[PDB]
Amino acid sequence: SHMCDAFVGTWKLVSSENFDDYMKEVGVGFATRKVAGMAKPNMIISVNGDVITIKSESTFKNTEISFILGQEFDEVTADDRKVKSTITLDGGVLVHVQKWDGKSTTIKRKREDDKLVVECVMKGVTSTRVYERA
């Protein structure tokens, strides 16, 4: 077993709050905000050795990242930013920091009851996205 065990599986989006405002703060343009905001992604998390893979699949886009904790990687986000990302585990929370163009945003993923709660923060704006097992 490893502690990241509790994240592994297939998850479906069940609620979202403030995501349009988060996207505005990140710099996402109108059309992508509307279509991305409509999406109901599944999140598929797996682990093989030290490598964690997170896939996010929707009618809008299918994305995939694989990474080792603490080891930076380059990521093309669903909104087409080219970012430098680092993901760590802090007290049981996956903490994903994206850097680009002198800006930064942080996405936290945590298990709470039977949910996987995703908190996205850009400056003072937070969006909370709740997933449940598929």
Ligand X SMILES: NC(=O)c1ccccc1
**CB under 5 to 8 A by kind: which of ligand 5WX, ligand X, none does 120 bind?**
ligand X
Q: What single-letter amino acid sits at 89?
A: L
Q: Between 87 and 120, name the residue whose CB sits nearer to ligand X.
A: 120
Task: Build a one-symbol-per-residue string for 62-101: x at contacts with ligand X by CB under 6 A, - elsewhere.
Answer: ----------------------------------------
Q: Is 22 exposed, middle or buried (0-12, 13-18, 19+ CB in 10 A)?
A: buried
Instruction: Kindly state whether residue 120 participates in binding ligand X, applying the rule CB under 6 A.
Output: yes
- Distance between CA atoms of residues 14 and 115, nearest Å: 9
- Distance between CA atoms of residues 40 and 69, nearest Å: 27
35 torsion bin: left (phi>0), alpha (psi -120 to 50), beta (else): alpha
What are the two backbone dihedrals, phi and then psi, of residue 77, each rounded to the nearest 5 degrees? -75, 170
Task: Build a one-symbol-per-residue string for 28-57: x at contacts with ligand 5WX by CB under 6 A, - elsewhere.
Answer: --------x--x-x--------------x-
Interface residue with ligand X, options 28, 94, 118, 122 (CB under 6 A): 118
Q: How many residues bind ligand 5WX (CB under 6 A)?
A: 9
Positions in the binding site for ligand 5WX (CB under 6 A): 36, 39, 41, 56, 58, 60-61, 63, 78
